[PDB]
Amino acid sequence: STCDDEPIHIPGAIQPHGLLLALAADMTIVAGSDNLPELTGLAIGALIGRSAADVFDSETHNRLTIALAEPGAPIAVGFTDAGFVGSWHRHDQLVFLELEPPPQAFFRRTNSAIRRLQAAETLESACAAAAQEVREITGFDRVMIYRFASDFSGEVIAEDRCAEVESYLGLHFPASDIPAQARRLYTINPVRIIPDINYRPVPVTPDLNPVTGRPIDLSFAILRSVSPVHLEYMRNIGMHGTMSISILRGERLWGLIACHHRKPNYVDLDGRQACELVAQVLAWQIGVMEEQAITRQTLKGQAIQRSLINDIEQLHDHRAGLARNSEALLELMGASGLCLHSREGVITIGQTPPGPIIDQLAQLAGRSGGSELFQTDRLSTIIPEAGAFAEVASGVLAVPLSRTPPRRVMLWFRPEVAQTVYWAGNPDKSGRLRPRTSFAAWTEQTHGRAIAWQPHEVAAAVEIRDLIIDVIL
Amino acid sequence: TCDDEPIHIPGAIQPHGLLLALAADMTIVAGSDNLPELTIGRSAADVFDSETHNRLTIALAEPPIAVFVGSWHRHDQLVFLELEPPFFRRTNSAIRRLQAAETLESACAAAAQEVREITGFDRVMIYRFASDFSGEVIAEDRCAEVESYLGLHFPASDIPAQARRLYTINPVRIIPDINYRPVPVTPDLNPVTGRPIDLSFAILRSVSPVHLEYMRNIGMHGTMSISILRGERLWGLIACHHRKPNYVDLDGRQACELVAQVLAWQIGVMEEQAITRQTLKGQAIQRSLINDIEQLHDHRAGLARNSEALLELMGASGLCLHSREGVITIGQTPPGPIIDQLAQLAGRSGGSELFQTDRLSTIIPEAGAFAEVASGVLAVPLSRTPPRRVMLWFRPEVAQTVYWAGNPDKSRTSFAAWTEQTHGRAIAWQPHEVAAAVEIRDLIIDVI
Ligand SMILES: */C=C/C1=C(C)C(=O)N/C1=C\C1=NC(=C\c2[nH]c(/C=C3\NC(=O)C(C=C)=C3C)c(C)c2CCC(=O)O)/C(CCC(=O)O)=C1C
Ligand SMILES: */C=C/C1=C(C)C(=O)N/C1=C\C1=NC(=C\c2[nH]c(/C=C3\NC(=O)C(C=C)=C3C)c(C)c2CCC(=O)O)/C(CCC(=O)O)=C1C
Numbered sequence: 048s049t050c051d052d053e054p055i056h057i058p059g060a061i062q063p064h065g066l067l068l069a070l071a072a073d074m075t076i077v078a079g080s081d082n083l084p085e086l087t088g089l090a091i092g093a094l095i096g097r098s099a100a101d102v103f104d105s106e107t108h109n110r111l112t113i114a115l116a117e118p119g120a121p122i123a124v125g126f127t128d129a130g131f132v133g134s135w136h137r138h139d140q141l142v143f144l145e146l147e148p149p150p151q152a153f154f155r156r157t158n159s160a161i162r163r164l165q166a167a168e169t170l171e172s173a174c175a176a177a178a179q180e181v182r183e184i185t186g187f188d189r190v191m192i193y194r195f196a197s198d199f200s201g202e203v204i205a206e207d208r209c210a211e212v213e214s215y216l217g218l219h220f221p222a223s224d225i226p227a228q229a230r231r232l233y234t235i236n237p238v239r240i241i242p243d244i245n246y247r248p249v250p251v252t253p254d255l256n257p258v259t260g261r262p263i264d265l266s267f268a269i270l271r272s273v274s275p276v277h278l279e280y281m282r283n284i285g286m287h288g289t290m291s292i293s294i295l296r297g298e299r300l301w302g303l304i305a306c307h308h309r310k311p312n313y314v315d316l317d318g319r320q321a322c323e324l325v326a327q328v329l330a331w332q333i334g335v336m337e338e339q340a341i342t343r344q345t346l347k348g349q350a351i352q353r354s355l356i357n358d359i360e361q362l363h364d365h366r367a368g369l370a371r372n373s374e375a376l377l378e379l380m381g382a383s384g385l386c387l388h389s390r391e392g393v394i395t396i397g398q399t400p401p402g403p404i405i406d407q408l409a410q411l412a413g414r415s416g417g418s419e420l421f422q423t424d425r426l427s428t429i430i431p432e433a434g435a436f437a438e439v440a441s442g443v444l445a446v447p448l449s450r451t452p453p454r455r456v457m458l459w460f461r462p463e464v465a466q467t468v469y470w471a472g473n474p475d476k477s478g479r480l481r482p483r484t485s486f487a488a489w490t491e492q493t494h495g496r497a498i499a500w501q502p503h504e505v506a507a508a509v510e511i512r513d514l515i516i517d518v519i520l
Numbered sequence: 521t522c523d524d525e526p527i528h529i530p531g532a533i534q535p536h537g538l539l540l541a542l543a544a545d546m547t548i549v550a551g552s553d554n555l556p557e558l559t560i561g562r563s564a565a566d567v568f569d570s571e572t573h574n575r576l577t578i579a580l581a582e583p584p585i586a587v588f589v590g591s592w593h594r595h596d597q598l599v600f601l602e603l604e605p606p607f608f609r610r611t612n613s614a615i616r617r618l619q620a621a622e623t624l625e626s627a628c629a630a631a632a633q634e635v636r637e638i639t640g641f642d643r644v645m646i647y648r649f650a651s652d653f654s655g656e657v658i659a660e661d662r663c664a665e666v667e668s669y670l671g672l673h674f675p676a677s678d679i680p681a682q683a684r685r686l687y688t689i690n691p692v693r694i695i696p697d698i699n700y701r702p703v704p705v706t707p708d709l710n711p712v713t714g715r716p717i718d719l720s721f722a723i724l725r726s727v728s729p730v731h732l733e734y735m736r737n738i739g740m741h742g743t744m745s746i747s748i749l750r751g752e753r754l755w756g757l758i759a760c761h762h763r764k765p766n767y768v769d770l771d772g773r774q775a776c777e778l779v780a781q782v783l784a785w786q787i788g789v790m791e792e793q794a795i796t797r798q799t800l801k802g803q804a805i806q807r808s809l810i811n812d813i814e815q816l817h818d819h820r821a822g823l824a825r826n827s828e829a830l831l832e833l834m835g836a837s838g839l840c841l842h843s844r845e846g847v848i849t850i851g852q853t854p855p856g857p858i859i860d861q862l863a864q865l866a867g868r869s870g871g872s873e874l875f876q877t878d879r880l881s882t883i884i885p886e887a888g889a890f891a892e893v894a895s896g897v898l899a900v901p902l903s904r905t906p907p908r909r910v911m912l913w914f915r916p917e918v919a920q921t922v923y924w925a926g927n928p929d930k931s932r933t934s935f936a937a938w939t940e941q942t943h944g945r946a947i948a949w950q951p952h953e954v955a956a957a958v959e960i961r962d963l964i965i966d967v968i
Contacts, residue, residue, distance in 0.1 A: 119613070121613075321608070520909065
């Protein structure tokens with residue numbers, strides 16, 4: 048898995064659709080797109096050292112001098128008197144600059160759909176809304192949204208695509224289809240467009256940082272050359288025009304708007320400017336629906352909680368009370384059974400496994416990770432011998448009642464479900480490395496897996512311990 | 521009597537635009553007296569011709585618009601419709617900036633900055649409410665030569681009680697000329713619910729003359745605000761200003777608002793990463809005097825041994841332990857309305873959330889005599905109402921000098937810079953102290 052090793056930020060080339068300049072403080076252009084000879088008469092070794100204004104208009108000269116002042120795109124490079132597009136940044140310690148060819152109606156489209164994501168009630172009503180709008184404005188034949196799992200494997204959770212375009216919906220993808228580095232930068236470079244995938248790269252000459260002992264960091268490059276492997280990837284997939292957007296909830300890369308096209312296709316700055324905003328608007332709503340659900344589960348835990356308050360007020364042992372209310376509260380968070388583990392007293396309510404519940408789970412419990420909690424959807428995975436009791440103990444939820452010794456333990460159990468997940472692949476079949484040739488959906492049925500706990504169910508158990516405590520006074 | 525003037529059924533609108541009220545299965549009933557003139561109760565299909573009525577009616581019937589400019593809404597059960605006389609990279613690039621802004625101040629002076637470049641307004645100030653709902657202009661972006669109101673406090677009265685629920689529910693407002701002569705609505709009879717015309721989501725609505733009095737005073741004749749909503753509670757306001765009158769068209773004023781929503785989350789971003797950047801430093805010395813209190817044969821010998829340490833945690837002038845039976849004081853002590861007038865003050869309208877206050881003579885008036893030890897107070901419930909054993913830390917009074925736009929004594933006249941020396945006020949709390957306290961009681965609970 049050298050996938051996580053290939054240095055992608057220094058491809059030593061940019062793409063042909065634009066041309067690029069790297070400049071120091073006083074606009075000595077350091078490096079250059081090797082198609083810049085076709086731009087000012089000067090082959091690259093002659094551009095080097097030269098000053099910036101001469102290249103340019105007198106209009107476009109001054110207007111970049113002022114944008115550089117503040118210690119952010121887009122200026123226009125009309126330079127001589129045609130019109131170019133000026134995206135820039137500072138990086139390393141020199142200023143980069145990439146160049147691109149050439150109101151209201153575009154913009155009403157945006158808020159009509161900004162405000163649409165605002166009304167979306169479910170993630171799915173939101174994401175077939177997200178993906179939909181990204182498509183009505185980037186025109187791509189296919190606009191999919193990709194969820195990341197814990198592993199950084201993924202799943203198409205929504206999709207919007209023009210008819211005749213074959214569908215990759217509900218499909219899982221390996222954690223390898225985006226390796227470590229790509230994610231480390233897509234967390235910080237939130238956007239990428241590659242418009243032709245058999246593009247011939249236009250190198251930069253030189254590949255040297257005059258600033259430091261380095262090749263050219265092309266991190267904040269929208270023009271940077273990408274891996275040939277991810278290209279073989281996309282000829283395989285049969286989509287020759289592609290674009291992504293990183294969807295970030297709080298500096299953890301959450302998922303991706305990956306758009307696709309059968310033929311090549313170009314999105315201008317404004318077009319993918321709006322698009323950054325869509326992933327931004329949606330990273331918001333995902334956090335709202337996330338948190339407005341935590342209040343509607345905190346909602347129906349009302350009627351059934353008050354039940355076991357009257358039941359510990361009357362019985363004055365809680366275990367006798369709560370375990371009476373057991374037939375509903377374990378369906379509340381859809382648990383199969385639970386058990387209460389006091390190191391003196393273990394009382395198992397409903398469905399539960401024996402004597403390695405105690406030691407092999409409570410010594411497994413919090414690790415005195417004070418602010419932490421323990422769970423799995425698979426338990427045969429972590430205590431392999433639980434494989435035997437996987438039928439009643441496949442997944443688990445558990446809550447401490449104290450700084451360890453006291454090691455008071457509550458735990459919810461979930462049984463094994465035969466679920467079917469499907470993917471393109473062959474996630475085992477993932478000289479150089481090589482990308483897959485076929486992406487037809489194969490289905491896997493899963494042994495030993497619980498249904499996924501969500502904070503939605505977690506908030507339930509979370510609330511329970513916080514009341515048992517209130518009563519104990 | 522400030523919280524009493526009914527502004528929402530003012531029975532009039534502003535002259536620059538004109539508006540009509542119609543009966544829902546569409547026929548038009550009650551008319552604004554600003555529109556009859558240059559163009560009584562009628563049937564409704566009767567609009568421009570089928571183009572702007574029908575395609576626009578079907579869009580409003582089933583589920584903005586262009587006709588003049590056609591904004592609408594449904595309210596107190598009838599159909600509204602307002603009319604006013606008749607870029608994008610800027611908007612996103614300021615989200616993109618509003619997202620990278622590192623501190624609360626860089627969040628607001630970015631906020632303040634775009635809203636100016638998109639209304640051209642002479643002054644775009646950002647106005648945070650403190651708890652009492654007095655306020656302070658915390659950041660500002662402005663055209664030169666125009667007087668600067670930054671770091672300035674204002675009365676809570678400059679926007680009264682009712683006015684606020686409205687900015688809590690109608691999130692935006694513009695009046696372009698403040699000496700508009702109000703052109704009435706006729707009638708101001710709701711034909712549906714038979715009482716005056718609720719003009720709540722009317723953006724053309726006639727505004728209060730009291731606040732008109734305001735802007736002739738201040739000398740700014742073109743103004744617009746946007747209210748900032750963090751979770752259904754009015755947190756603050758983008759108050760924009762202009763020396764002359766000025767109109768911002770509709771799509772132009774939609775962009776202004778969206779910025780405040782971005783900041784309503786962006787502030788919520790800051791709200792929560794300072795909330796965890798403190799719990800760290802934080803643990804390291806805390807966990808120490810937990811084990812030194814966790815020398816519990818029982819706790820006072822444990823706690824009060826290291827209390828002289830845990831007291832330094834929160835600017836604890838004194839604290840108290842309040843169980844209905846056992847009240848234990850660490851440090852400087854208030855005596856008998858500690859028990860009764862604070863723990864009943866505590867969980868009543870507890871609202872599941874805690875009580876903290878900087879002022880006590882304002883919340884229990886007799887605390888005035890004890891300002892030297894009790895001017896501000898914090899308390900945490902142990903939780904059910906009651907026994908509700910409540911712990912509480914307090915703070916003495918600090919002499920700060922606060923600045924105001926003119927004296928805080930009202931009708932108002934002029935708002936030049938004057939100083940008040942503020943007595944009986946304690947110095948504040950944000951969670952590096954509040955989160956401390958929360959974590960602290962969590963410890964005490966884990967203890968018994
Ligand atoms: C082991 C090497 C790789 C395999 C196998 C593979 O599939 N990808 C490998 C490395 C890289 N991928 C790069 C970019 C990239 N990968 C994806 C993955 C998907 N694209 C899709 O459309 C879907 C699903 C519908 C998936 C799962 C994406 C989206 C991207 C970004 C570009 C785009 O939008 O298509 C990559 C980085 C190249 C670079 O930009 O430097 C590498 C190294
Ligand atoms: C208690 C009555 C009032 C006093 C006293 C007063 O000074 N004004 C009073 C009444 C109203 N104010 C209304 C709206 C309003 N008020 C403010 C106050 C400020 N403007 C500023 O620029 C700053 C600070 C820099 C402050 C504190 C604002 C911003 C607004 C909203 C409109 C605007 O942008 O100016 C108001 C409502 C009138 C209506 O809607 O009919 C009333 C009654």
